[PDB]
Design a protein around this ligand. Structure first.
Ligand SMILES: CN1[C@@H]2CC[C@H]1C[C@H](OC(=O)[C@H](CO)c1ccccc1)C2
Length: 399
């Protein structure tokens, strides 16, 4: 009764883990569209979750119910090598996606030509090899450093100390989760500055300070370029001489920038207080309609793009005058919705990670502060919950 209740739940759950893992991996070779950099990291995540669903969850619950595996299975070393290697290659892949999106939102042009489907192979391989040299040599050959599995019923030999366990908890969950949460602070507040500025520039037409804030947000976005940052700074200082060089920065990437000069003249020869907002929006639209700047703006039009930014970009296109700008705006917001889906997927995986690893982590923190604080059943629930993250991961992509 009690034994069969647990076993049924994790037997069907393991099937959902590996079926989704097997389906997505063969889907990369089925459709040649899911090999891109953004989805390449998901491939490594899927391989890791496949490993820890095939060889870690099943054996974990088999140990938990049929306690006949304690100190009786010599494949436990391989099982935990795969376990820790896949778990760490999922943690490092989560932080690698976090750093990749932070550098694609704050350095989106240095990373434009530095994030291709061939450098993804190198980045993913470096992450996987780092996880390997961390765990697989260690988890396996630490015993040789006690030839048998050192007193190991199923567990890992070198994770036996409160300080060592706390250090792993920090450097794998704690420190990475705070790091990711810091880049999420930066990215969320950055996209929020962009969205609030571009909304006060659309919901208010008499606030020249909101326009300055929008230009400052764009400069914080487009800081890699000398030309673009110089143009934004000059446009901010124009309203907040050497204005001849201003058109040199405007005519440095002229594809449809002919109307940019006309808008600049109209907004700087009439001492405009609101036509500068139209100029800023036309500049944003022109930047968006570029093969290199599209992800840069698309990242910032991910968060606040409910209603305000669609209207803002539409007004900018209507002021720019592009013959066919509606299709360009539709494509730009399609890219923005793709960025929104990617960000929501990142948030879902991060929240599942934090909602399934925290409990174990929290109990690890209190395992050095009055150690006798939680019973064995709560610990087992937390440890199994950590594996539940693998089950959700294919479902995160599918939704
Ligand atoms: C031990 N298993 C269960 C399920 C997967 C793995 C990790 C979870 O435990 C942790 O979070 C540690 C850090 O303390 C850790 C160790 C290796 C890599 C990343 C993170 C619990």
């Amino acid at each position: 009764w009690q034994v069969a209740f647990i076993g049924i739940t994790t037997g069907l759950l393991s099937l959902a883990t590996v079926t989704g893992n097997l389906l997505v991996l063969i889907s990369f070779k089925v459709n040649t569209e899911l090999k891109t950099v953004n989805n390449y990291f998901l491939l490594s995540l899927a391989c890791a979750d496949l490993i820890i669903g095939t060889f870690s969850m099943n054996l974990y619950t088999t140990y938990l119910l049929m306690g006949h595996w304690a100190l009786g299975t010599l494949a436990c070393d391989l099982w935990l090598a795969l376990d820790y290697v896949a778990s760490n290659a999922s943690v490092m892949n989560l932080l690698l996606i976090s750093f990749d999106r932070y550098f694609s939102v704050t350095r989106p042009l240095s990373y434009r030509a530095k994030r291709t489907p061939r450098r993804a192979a190198l980045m993913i391989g470096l992450a996987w090899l780092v996880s390997f040299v961390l765990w697989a040599p260690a988890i396996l050959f630490w015993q040789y450093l006690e030839r048998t599995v050192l007193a190991g019923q199923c567990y890992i030999q070198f994770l036996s100390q409160p300080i060592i366990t706390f250090g792993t908890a920090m450097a794998a969950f704690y420190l990475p989760v705070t790091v990711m949460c810091t880049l999420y602070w930066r990215i969320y507040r950055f996209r929020r500055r962009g969205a609030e500025a571009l909304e006060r520039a659309f919901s208010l037409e008499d606030d020249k300070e909101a326009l300055l804030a929008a230009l400052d947000a764009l400069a914080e976005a487009f800081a890699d370029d000398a030309e673009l940052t110089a143009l934004l700074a000059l446009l901010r200082r124009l309203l907040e001489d050497e204005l001849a060089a201003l058109r040199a920065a405007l005519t440095r990437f002229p594809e449809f920038r002919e109307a940019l000069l006309a808008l600049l003249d109209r907004y700087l020869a009439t001492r405009d207080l609101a036509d500068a907002r139209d100029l800023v929006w036309a500049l944003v639209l022109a930047i968006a309609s570029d093969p290199r700047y599209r992800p840069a703006v698309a990242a910032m039009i991910a968060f606040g793009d409910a209603e305000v930014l669609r209207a803002g970009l539409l007004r900018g296109a209507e002021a720019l005058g592009l013959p066919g700008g509606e299709a360009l705006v539709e494509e730009i917001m399609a890219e923005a919705e793709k960025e929104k889906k990617a960000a929501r997927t990142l948030s879902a995986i991060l929240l599942a990670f934090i909602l399934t690893w925290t409990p174990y982590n929290i109990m690890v923190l209190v395992s050095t502060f009055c150690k006798d604080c939680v019973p064995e059943t709560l610990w087992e629930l937390g440890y199994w919950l950590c594996y539940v993250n693998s089950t959700i991961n294919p479902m995160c992509y599918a939704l």
